């Protein structure tokens, strides 16, 4: 749910 | 312009250049996006629209949608970049399309990608099973469909149930572009872009085209950067006068994070280089792209 995953 | 590309490729500096852009990129506040009543309207918690360029729904309840107006003054084109709609924002998405008078939607993701849900099924897949968005008084009906090997164009009818006005929306769905990845070839990308261009959906008499992927910054950024660069080349009437890096920084004044990997930036160069041929006068390279795209079967 973080774009930078 | 190929000089600058041939050098970076030999020197292997693409990741350094991409990091340079991240460092220099604008940083504007996103207060409306971070309000608690808007937590369920954001797909990712580290991707938000800037307050100054966000699209506002014409709504008294809550005017928020995770979408940004990217207005390229010099290239004379506007884009709306947005996240792939959520189950609860499909009505807002089409409210936005209607209120901004968009004629085209470009979708660069798939609803399910490598396992995870990236997007809600926000448009109808069967003529006889139309969608009604009661919260926003809209109705959406699939009219026809043009399926190609790596993309599909659908004709949709958007009806404002209040006034019974109807509009035709063209949906361009690119199905073979992975998250954090690039298109198969510049030919298949440019063939897709020129299909969008040919449709008239980007004409200035229409509202801004809506472009989305998963977050609305990565693949969406690549698409809009290439189109604007080719626009600038034609308008200035000088190919190698366009600095891809400065154009991307200009776009990132309007939405954070545009272009998500260094390889997507490399591809953007590759696509503008290949597209320059058409701008320079070789109008027939367009039919070439169609052939290398394998769009049939």
Author numbering:
A (entry chain B): 2006 to 2010
B (entry chain A): 3 to 299
The study reports:
Protein Tyrosine Phosphatase 1B (PTP1B) is the prototypical protein tyrosine phosphatase and plays an essential role in the regulation of several kinase-driven signalling pathways. Here we identify PTP1B as an inhibitor of IL-6 and show that, in vitro, it can dephosphorylate all four members of the JAK family. Asp181 acts as both a proton donor, enabling protonation of the tyrosyl leaving group, and as a proton acceptor, receiving a proton from the water molecule that hydrolyzes the phosphoenzyme intermediate.
To determine the substrate-bound form of the D181A/Q262A double mutant we used the bisphosphorylated activation loop sequence of all four members of the JAK family as substrate peptides. Nevertheless, in multiple co-substrate structures of this mutant, we observed that both steps of the reaction had occurred; dephosphorylation of the pTyr, presumably via the usual cysteinyl phosphate intermediate, as well as hydrolysis of that cysteinyl-phosphate. The phosphate was not present as a cysteinyl-phosphate intermediate nor as the pTyr substrate but rather as free phosphate. This suggests that dephosphorylation had occurred within the crystal, as well as subsequent hydrolysis of the phosphoenzyme intermediate, but that neither the phosphate nor the tyrosyl-peptide product had completely diffused out of the active site. Accommodating both of these species within the active site necessitates a reorientation of both the tyrosine (back and across, towards solvent) and the phosphate (towards Q266, where it has displaced the water molecule W1 that Q266 coordinates) compared to previous structures. The occupancy of the phosphate was refined as ~60% suggesting that a proportion of it had left the active site but that the majority still remained. In some of the JAK activation loop structures with the D181A/Q262A double mutant the register of the peptide in the active site is possibly scrambled, with populations of both the first and second tyrosines being present in the active site.
